[PDB]
Each structure stands twice: as structure tokens, then as C-alpha cells.
């Protein structure tokens, strides 16, 4: 427990970061700006053969390394800052209460089980738009629950979905959807055992690209 605090500046609830910012809202704004810039290039990268914990670490590093020393490192892992201090957070405990996200080494076991399900399904390549959306919703819910990093989980997870989609010929567009909707769908699937909303959300954000790109390509 005592190591949790070493993610933050002394006497503050602000995450240590490479910009030196000590206001948590301003940190958020700068972090949003830096990761948006990095996501533009990461979208053009070729996809790996496995969608696993190493790939998630790769995404997290690529998106957050300008902001966080521990970019690419999961929160179950002791991390030592340049300042000498060592941080980790095996359990999310807001206000001292347990919330139902993966704890400790459960993070790695959940990500493993997710790679194994995806690998066995050829990473969802060769499926209809609807069937892809229905599986992709389940993947998204698995990642919600894993919450592998200290911070940056949402953007990391969305990017993982974009790349899985892209490798299957689909644009996954989270800009189509409101925050309130994503929260509703996440809680339904995680707390109320109700997959339908996340399924309907993925049907709304999964758009076939193969044919459009081929048209564009030939016109050019
Ligand atoms: Br982003
Ligand atoms: Cl400090």
C-alpha cells in the first residue's frame, strides 16, 4: 500500500509526469494533447500476430512515453522512478473501498486469457461486420476489467480495438459515441452481467473499410 503514493508528487493527488505539471486537470489536458499526436502515427503501424499483454504495453508506451516514466509498465509491476522511489498499485481502492477490477497478477492472467481467445479466433479476421462487433464488445469488456495500467487505460484500450479492427478490415470509431454511453455500456457488462449495450455500441462504431480503401487506392 505504501508504494501507491510514489506515483504522485509529495502532498498531492497529481501523478508524477515528465512535463512537471502539478495541477491534475492541466496534466490531463497536456496528456490528451500528447497521446492524440502519437495515436495518429500508431494507426499506420502494421499489426502484430498476437493481441496480448506485450502489445498492450507497446501501445501504452507509444501513446504515453512523453508524459509518464512508467509508460509501457503495468501497475502490478514495481516501477522505480529516476527520483529513486518505487511505485505500484496492485489493487484499485478509491476512497479505501475495493472496486471490481483485476488485482495483482490477475492482470497478466486476464490478458493471457484474452490473447488465447483471440488467437484461437484468428483475431476475429474473416468474420461479418456484426459477428466482429459482437466479439469485439467482449474483448472491450475483458480489457475494462483488466485495467492494466496506473493511468491511460481508456486510450490504450481504444487503440487496441482500433488495431484489431484494422487488421480485420474495419474502422473502429469511438468518436461516434458519447462518454455517457460508454460508461453505461461498461457498467452493464461488468456489473450487471448485461452484454447487449456494449454489443449495440460496437455495431454503431464498426465500419467496413476494405472496399472504400480499394476504391480510393485505385482512384489516386
Ligand atoms: Br488518443
Ligand atoms: Cl515528489
Residue numbers in the entry: 0 to 219
Recite the paper's sentences:
The FIC fold comprises eight conserved α-helices and encompasses a characteristic active site loop between helices α4 and α5 that forms most of the catalytic center and the substrate binding pocket.
However, BepC proteins are special in that they have a lysine instead of a Mg2+-coordinating aspartate/glutamate in the FIC motif. Thus, BepC proteins appear to require no divalent cation for substrate binding, in contrast to all FIC AMP transferases characterized so far. For the FIC domain of BepC with its non-canonical FIC signature motif, no enzymatic activity has been found although it binds to the RhoGEF GEF-H1 and activates this signaling protein by relocalization to the plasma membrane. For BepC, despite its canonical signature motif, no catalytic activity has yet been found, but its BepFIC domain mediates protein–protein interaction with the RhoGEF GEF-H1, thereby activating RhoA signaling. Bqu_BepC FIC crystals were grown from a solution of 10% w/v PEG 4000, 20% v/v glycerol, 0.1 M bicine/Trizma base, pH 8.5, and 0.03 M each of NaF, NaBr, and NaI. Data for Bqu_BepC FIC, B15_Bep8 FIC, and Bcl_Bep5 FIC were collected at 100 K on a Rayonix MX-300 detector at a wavelength of 0.9786 Å on beamline 21-ID-G at the Advanced Photon Source (APS, Argonne, IL, USA).
